[PDB]
Structure formats: C-alpha cells, structure tokens
Paper text:
BRDT is a tissue-restricted BET subfamily member expressed in pachytene spermatocytes, diplotene spermatocytes, and round spermatids. Deletions of either BD1 or both BD1 and BD2 in the mouse BRDT gene result in male sterility, indicating that BRDT is a testis-specific target for male contraception. Our drug discovery campaign on BRDT, a validated spermatogenic-specific contraceptive target, yielded rapid discovery of potent and specific inhibitors of the second bromodomain of BRDT that have unique binding characteristics to BRDT-BD2 relative to BRDT-BD1.
CDD-1102 was identified as a potent, BD2 versus BD1 selective compound with enhanced metabolic stability over other compounds. CDD-1102 binds to the extended pocket consisting of the KAc binding pocket, ZA channel, WPF shelf, and a channel formed between ZA and BC loops. Specifically, the aniline nitrogen interacts with the side chain of Y308 in the ZA loop, whereas the two internal amide nitrogens form hydrogen bonds with the backbone carbonyl of Y350 and the side chain of N351 at the BC loop. The aniline ring binds deep into a hydrophobic pocket consisting of nonpolar residues from the ZA loop (V298) and B and C helices (Y308 and C347). The indazole ring docks to the WPF shelf (W292, P293, F294), the ZA (V298, L303, and L305) and the BC (H355) loops, and the C helix (V357). The terminal amide does not provide any hydrogen bonding interactions, and the terephthalamide ring docks to a shallow hydrophobic surface consisting of N307 and V311 side chains at the ZA loop. Two ordered water molecules mediate BRDT-BD2/CDD-1102 interactions at the ZA channel and the KAc binding pocket. The backbone carbonyl oxygen atoms of P293 and M343 form hydrogen bonds with the aniline and indazole nitrogens through ordered waters.
Author numbering: 262 to 379
Amino acid sequence: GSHMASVTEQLRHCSEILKEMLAKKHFSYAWPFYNPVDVNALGLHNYYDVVKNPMDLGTIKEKMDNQEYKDAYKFAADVRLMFMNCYKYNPPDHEVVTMARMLQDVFETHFSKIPIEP
Ligand SMILES: CNC(=O)c1ccc(C(=O)Nc2cc(NC(=O)c3ccc4c(c3)c(-c3ccc(N)cc3C)nn4C)ccc2C)cc1
C-alpha cells in the first residue's frame, strides 16, 4: 500500500530517465538504440547467436507503457542488458561501443540518484 506507492514512484523516475535518453541532446550517440538493431540492413553476421536477449529503447518504452516493470531494478536490468548486448557483439573500439558507453553514462548517473522512497 504505502510500499507500492514508493515502488511506482521510482518507475516514474525511470520514465523521466527514459525520456532523457530519448531527448534530442543525446541523439548523436543514442540513435543506434532507439529501435531494434536492423540486422539485415547492417549486414550483421550471427547477431542472434551472440545476443540471445535483444533489447532496445523502443521495447523498453513499450514495456513502460504497458506497465510491465514490477519495479525500477528490472527496468534498470533491461537498459543494462541493451548496453551489454552492444558490448558483447561489437569490437571494443567500435564507434557504437563509444556511443553505448556515452549513453550509458547518462543512464547510470541519473538512475543512481532515484531516492529510496519517492
Ligand atoms: C559465436 N559468434 C561470435 O562470437 C561473433 C560473431 C560475429 C560477430 C560480429 O560480426 N561482430 C562485429 C560487429 C560489428 N558491428 C557493426 O558493424 C555495426 C555497425 C553499425 C551498427 C551496429 C554494429 C549496431 C549495433 C549492433 C548490435 C548491437 N547489440 C548494438 C548496436 C548499437 N548499431 N549500428 C548502427 C563490426 C565488426 C564485427 C566483427 C561477433 C562475434
């Protein structure tokens, strides 16, 4: 009751974080993560044998909208899964790895400041 009000309010902060990562200020490094990776358009070999749980910001926003996250920790897991998929598949100095780490710095710095009860 009381506890649920706090959990839902954290997921509201997660909504604010998601909208921040979708803001035009981050577009130059966030755009590869807006939608599912277009494996066919980029000619990516064996993507679905390296990355078994694909995740992107669009799917996260759909899960948010369906109210699919039970709490903020599971929201964070998906964001972090999305970034980890990109570290797993691409060469460590690839340009999208640099982009993943820049967008991830935005997520991690904001997520770390969500209060325990609010
Ligand atoms: C057992 N099998 C294996 O172990 C294995 C098999 C094959 C590969 C293999 O081919 N890696 C590989 C990937 C790239 N990457 C690209 O060329 C590129 C270009 C543009 C992109 C992207 C990627 C993405 C993107 C793709 C995936 C994710 N998750 C997130 C994002 C953001 N987005 N955009 C715009 C280049 C070279 C190599 C060798 C590695 C290991």
